[PDB]
């Protein structure tokens, strides 16, 4: 329940939990796919893949350490998990790979075998993971010609034309000290870790700052990846959401909980206290849907994603869903808000407190990099419970009502009507 | 309902076209676009093109008919003037 963080030469952030059997240690850099270019796009993902290379991974396996990495938009992270006792040997492997082997991982035999793996990896994604593929393209069109548009896994064309020098160039511009935070989760104490860190000196590229860019911006638009050979239609639609560290950060997430997620095959899901379900179940407008409030450093996306085999009624799916969202500005009820608060706490809890320290590190790391600290789970609940119907209405009237949208879809989307028809539904006629 | 005869047009989701794959489209909200004023400087010299290719198909048949009309008219005028009463008696009945 304690979020301890101190700075000496490097910023150290930890969160202890004695009941945890293992401990995870790692470095989280304040730069991700949002820092790349259209041409070196996929370099971060490539780094992650060599860090988990058979060679580097075997060295950690002998020592009894497990490797894990995650490439996001605003950040990047390299994590090593171990037993509570080997909390020192994780730091040896961390330093040995980011300073000593910052040239042994980049061999012309390791790099090629890895490049061939991320190529089959990113290709498999585009060929089969339609829901995530669609969600990735949603960011692509919504934030076109802006940092948030670049996909995390990179594109096949920028990937196959990438070389060892590109990795180095990126590493020497972002893997800096002022653009880093060392994180530790599990059971180890803050004072326990900071000592092993403040022990080993050496700055290594100190005072150096990463390159700057241009601010991210939402552009109402769409990308339609029609493919009549797929057995379904997958669509994602959203408005400009909230950036992390926004006053309405929670109002937005609550609003998404009101409509929540659905799965037509799960008996219990068909019974949720969601008004939209009365409309969509009559003719079974979809197999599933899920709302989200994605937040990043400069912006975010608020909307929903859905999958359906009812290809001749896609317009009803979109129409009923948008009519429900209209409600947030004009008629959302106290009980809908209250139901959302309870369910938001339950999901926010299950995230911030899972039985896995690697998840804790990513959540902690990502937060401290943006606001310099982490809001305690109990602090969130105070903010969540304080939200009134009046708040949700003021938010919706600014973010949802008669606002541009961004759309992306693949599969049998002939039935997804034109942009203007969808856009017109972002409001209602009144006297 | 009662069985319907097969046609060459369906409806949204089953239009009757061939299966599409590989084509990706993009568009941008009219709201985000430059309000109507840019249809000049960039869209002016480009215009008038769908009549520079067509005017001949219209003009030649028009010319042929206008000439033919003018001729017969002027001939009728001559026939009913003093100078042409001689020719009138000839071509008439």
Curated annotation (Swiss-Prot), chain A:
InterPro entries: Metalloenz_LuxS/M16, MPP/UQCRC_Complex, Pept_M16_N, Peptidase_M16_C
Chief location category: mitochondrion
Localization in the cell: Mitochondrion inner membrane
GO BP term, pick one: cellular respiration
MF-aspect GO terms: metal ion binding; metalloendopeptidase activity
Keywords recorded for this protein, A-Z: Electron transport, Membrane, Mitochondrion, Mitochondrion inner membrane, Respiratory chain, Transit peptide, Transport
Membrane topology: Peripheral membrane protein
Record Gene3D superfamilies: Metalloenzyme, LuxS/M16 peptidase-like
Parts forming coiled coils: none
Single GO cellular component term: mitochondrion
Record note on quaternary structure: Component of the ubiquinol-cytochrome c oxidoreductase (cytochrome b-c1 complex, complex III, CIII), a multisubunit enzyme composed of 10 subunits. The complex is composed of 3 respiratory subunits cytochrome b (COB), cytochrome c1 (CYT1) and Rieske protein (RIP1), 2 core protein subunits COR1 and QCR2, and 5 low-molecular weight protein subunits QCR6, QCR7, QCR8, QCR9 and QCR10.
Biological role stated in the UniProt entry: Component of the ubiquinol-cytochrome c oxidoreductase, a multisubunit transmembrane complex that is part of the mitochondrial electron transport chain which drives oxidative phosphorylation.
Other comment: Present with 19300 molecules/cell in log phase SD medium.
Sequence similarity: Belongs to the peptidase M16 family. UQCRC1/QCR1 subfamily.
Designated name of the protein: Cytochrome b-c1 complex subunit 1, mitochondrial
UniProt organism field: Saccharomyces cerevisiae (strain ATCC 204508 / S288c)
Origin organism lineage: Eukaryota, Fungi, Dikarya, Ascomycota, Saccharomycotina
From Swiss-Prot, chain B:
Positions in the Mitochondrial matrix compartment: 1-48
Mitochondrial intermembrane membrane side: 80-93
Cell compartment(s), UniProt: Mitochondrion inner membrane
Transmembrane segments: 49-79
UniProt KW keywords: Electron transport, Membrane, Mitochondrion, Mitochondrion inner membrane, Respiratory chain, Transmembrane, Transmembrane helix, Transport
Superkingdom, natural source: Eukaryota
GO cellular component: mitochondrial inner membrane; mitochondrion; respiratory chain complex III
GO biological-process terms attached to the record: aerobic respiration; cellular respiration; mitochondrial electron transport, ubiquinol to cytochrome c
Pfam families: UcrQ
Topology of the protein relative to the lipid bilayer: Single-pass membrane protein
UniProt-listed PANTHER family: CYTOCHROME B-C1 COMPLEX SUBUNIT 8, UBIQUINOL-CYTOCHROME C REDUCTASE COMPLEX UBIQUINONE-BINDING PROTEIN QP-C
Family under the similarity heading: Belongs to the UQCRQ/QCR8 family.
Misc: Present with 6140 molecules/cell in log phase SD medium.
Subunit structure and binding partners: Component of the ubiquinol-cytochrome c oxidoreductase (cytochrome b-c1 complex, complex III, CIII), a multisubunit enzyme composed of 10 subunits. The complex is composed of 3 respiratory subunits cytochrome b (COB), cytochrome c1 (CYT1) and Rieske protein (RIP1), 2 core protein subunits COR1 and QCR2, and 5 low-molecular weight protein subunits QCR6, QCR7, QCR8, QCR9 and QCR10.
Function: Component of the ubiquinol-cytochrome c oxidoreductase, a multisubunit transmembrane complex that is part of the mitochondrial electron transport chain which drives oxidative phosphorylation.
Protein name: Cytochrome b-c1 complex subunit 8, mitochondrial
Species in which this protein is naturally found: Saccharomyces cerevisiae (strain ATCC 204508 / S288c) (Baker's yeast)
Lineage start: Eukaryota, Fungi, Dikarya, Ascomycota, Saccharomycotina
Gene: QCR8
């Amino acid at each position: 329940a304690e979020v301890t963080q101190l700075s000496n030469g490097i910023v150290v952030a930890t969160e202890h939990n004695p009941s945890a059997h293992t401990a995870s240690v790692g470095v989280v850099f304040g730069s991700g796919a949002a820092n790349e270019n259209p041409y070196n796009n996929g370099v971060s993902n490539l780094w992650k893949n060599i860090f988990l290379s058979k060679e580097n991974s075997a060295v950690a396996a002998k020592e009894g350490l497990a490797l894990s990495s995650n490439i996001s938009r605003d950040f990047q992270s390299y994590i090593v998990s171990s037993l509570p006792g080997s909390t020192d040997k994780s730091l040896d492997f961390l330093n040995q790979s980011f300073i000593q082997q910052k040239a042994n991982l980049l061999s012309s035999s390791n790099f090629e075998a890895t490049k061939k793996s991320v190529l089959k990896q990113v290709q498999d994604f585009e060929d089969n993971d339609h829901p995530n593929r669609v969600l990735e393209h949603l960011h692509s069109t919504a934030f076109q010609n802006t940092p948030l548009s670049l996909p995390t896994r990179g594109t096949l064309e920028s990937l196959e034309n990438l070389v060892v020098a590109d990795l180095e160039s990126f590493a020497n511009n972002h893997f800096l000290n002022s653009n880093a935070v060392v994180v530790g989760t599990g059971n180890i104490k803050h004072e326990d870790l900071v000592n092993s860190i403040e022990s080993k000196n050496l700055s290594l590229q100190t005072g150096t700052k990463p390159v700057l860019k241009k601010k991210a911006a939402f552009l109402g638009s769409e990308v339609r990846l029609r493919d009549d050979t797929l057995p379904k239609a997958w669509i994602s639609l959203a408005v400009e959401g909230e950036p992390v560290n926004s006053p309405n950060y929670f109002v937005a997430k609550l609003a998404a909980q009101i409509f929540g997620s659905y799965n037509a095959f799960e008996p219990a899901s068909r019974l949720q206290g969601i008004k939209l379900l009365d409309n969509i179940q009559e003719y079974q407008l979809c197999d599933n849907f899920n709302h989200f409030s994605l937040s990043y450093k400069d912006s975010g996306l608020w909307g929903f994603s859905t999958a359906t085999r009812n290809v001749t009624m896609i317009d009803d799916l979109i129409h009923f869903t948008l009519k429900q969202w209209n409600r947030l500005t004009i008629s959302v009820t106290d009980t809908e808000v209250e139901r959302a608060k309870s369910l938001l706490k339950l999901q926010l809890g299950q995230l911030y407190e899972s039985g896995n320290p690697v998840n804790d590190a990513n959540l902690l790391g990502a937060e401290v990099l943006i606001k310099g600290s982490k809001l305690s789970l109990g602090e969130a609940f105070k903010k969540i419970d304080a939200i009134t119907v009046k708040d949700v209405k003021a938010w919706a009237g600014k973010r949802l009502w008669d606002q541009d949208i961004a759309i992306a879809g693949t599969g049998q989307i002939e039935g997804l009507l034109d942009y203007m028809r969808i856009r017109s539904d972002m409001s209602m006629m009144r006297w | 309902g009662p069985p319907s005869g097969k046609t060459y047009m369906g409806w949204w989701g089953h239009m009757g076209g061939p299966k599409q794959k590989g084509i990706t489209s993009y568009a941008v909200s009219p709201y985000a676009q430059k309000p109507l004023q840019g249809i000049f400087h960039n869209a002016v010299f480009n215009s008038f093109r769908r009549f520079k290719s067509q005017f001949l198909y219209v003009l030649i048949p028009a010319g042929i008919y206008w000439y033919w009309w003018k001729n017969g008219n002027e001939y009728n005028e001559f026939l009913y003037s003093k100078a042409g009463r001689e020719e009138l008696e000839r071509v008439n009945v």
